[PDB]
Amino acid sequence: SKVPYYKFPSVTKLRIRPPAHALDEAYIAKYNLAISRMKDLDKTQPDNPIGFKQQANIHCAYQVHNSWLFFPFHRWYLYFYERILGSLIDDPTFGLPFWNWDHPKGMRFPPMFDVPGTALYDERRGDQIHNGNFIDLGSFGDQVETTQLQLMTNNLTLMYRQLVTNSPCPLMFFGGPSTVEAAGTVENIPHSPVHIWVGTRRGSVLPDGKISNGEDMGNFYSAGLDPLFYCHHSNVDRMWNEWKATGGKRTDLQNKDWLNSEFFFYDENGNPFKVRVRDCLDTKKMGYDYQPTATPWRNFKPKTKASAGKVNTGSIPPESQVFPLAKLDKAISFSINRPASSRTQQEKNAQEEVLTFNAIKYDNRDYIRFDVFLNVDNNVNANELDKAEFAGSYTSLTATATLRLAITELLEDIGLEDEDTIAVTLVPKKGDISIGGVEIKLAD
Ligand SMILES: [Cu+2]
Ligand SMILES: [O]
């Protein structure tokens, strides 16, 4: 090969990635100009690596997904993508905006992307994105079944569960290192539902005609053909920064195999380079940062319980009697034993208590979603996620996958810390789902 490693150029001012909503019209104007000139290369220089289609093919070429390589790959991906945009308009400080879908003011479709006849527009998008509707951060392809207020409440609860509760340590945030999918918190939710919510409905008839397969954002191979793809991933990249902001155990993976993993990218001059994961840990050392923006989901630890008291775990079947579960056709409840109870804080400091669902199997072309609750029964209202019992959710953009949930916070809030056995309830929302086994392990 002999391709050199990337040399960081000299860094003048920091590039500032701003929120996509209510951006000034002059910013939108040159963002459209950069994209327009990127798309022109599809015609004038189809094999130029910086052109629109060739950049889209980076996602459609790159096992980088459902692994701990998810965040660093897309950071480097967007790093060169942002540099290409700035260089096409002679703007060396151009910042790639981020779709602020974790903030109530950024949860609508960003207006700048919905202007037909502009370079940022894409007709291959779904219909539920208009009419001033809020995004559904737990979308599985259907229309929202709740009020917009409950939708907002669920969105912010999902953010809290995904950025705080279920990502207390690096491996659960970034993902894991076979066909078993080991996605982290964010790559599952809200990353996957945003793709689903923006894309066309699978089975629908596309522009002209083809049966849509979810193009553009809702299908993995064509997602890069929507300019909004990069704006979404800008906020995904921002989630990495916001996750580390509170310190403690939420730091970068220190494993040498992860740090020294390499990717391949062409820079804005069309020159090939190898890049290391260890060299993208600090965005400011790559020449960019995010505009400081409030994160109100940090305050959405649920304050109420769905059900008072404790479930009688003797009236429900044990995990050993339910799994392997051939089909999660409806809500089911089961008891499960904990490795230890009455844990001290020094034990919690060492090992997280993790509820793990093993061998989630389904057809990778179907929309999949199920929710997990502790200490409820089969009649739990799964539309109300702002409850102390809501643990998390699994979704999918035959596949085999794993879901891991950090439950120490819930055990404290619900009052189950001295219990050796607890109740778990699975609520399916979409798809044909089988589950091989469920366990509570004390992890890293
Ligand atoms: Cu994505
Ligand atoms: O992605």
Numbering used by the authors: 35 to 96, 109 to 223, 228 to 447, 459 to 505
List passages from the publication reporting this PDB structure.
PPOs are type-III copper enzymes exhibiting significant oxidation reactions in the majority of organisms. TYRs catalyse the ortho-hydroxylation of monophenols (monophenolase activity, EC 1.14.18.1) and the subsequent two electron oxidation of the resulting o-diphenols to the corresponding o-quinones (diphenolase activity, EC 1.10.3.1), whereas COs are only capable of catalysing the latter diphenolase reaction. Based on kinetic results, SlPPO1 was identified as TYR, whereas SlPPO2 was classified as CO. The active site region is composed of a typical four-α-helical bundle harboring the dicopper active centre, where each copper ion (CuA and CuB) is coordinated by three histidine residues.
SlPPO1 was crystallized as latent apo- and holo-enzyme (without and with copper). The structure of the holo-form lacks a large part of the N-terminal domain (model starts at Ser35) leading to the absence of two highly conserved disulphide bonds (Cys11-Cys27 and Cys26-Cys94). A characteristic structural feature of some PPOs is the formation of the thioether bridge which is missing in SlPPO1. Despite these gaps, especially that one between the first and second CuA coordinating histidines (His93 and His111), the electron density of the active site region indicates an intact dicopper centre. The two copper ions exhibit low occupancy values (CuA = 0.3 and CuB = 0.1) which might be the result of copper loss during the X-ray diffraction experiment. The presence of an ‘oxygen moiety’ between the copper ions suggests that the enzyme was crystallized in its met-form with a CuA-CuB distance of 4.2 Å, which is in accordance to the met-forms of other structurally known plant PPOs. The position of Phe270 is significantly shifted in comparison to the gatekeeper residue position in other plant PPO structures further confirming its high flexibility, which might have an impact on the catalytic behaviour of SlPPO1. Comparison of the gatekeeper residue positions between the apo- and the holo-structure reveals a significant positional shift, which is only possible owing to the absence of the thioether bridge in the holo-structure. The Phe270 residue of the holo-form would sterically interfere with a present thioether bridge.
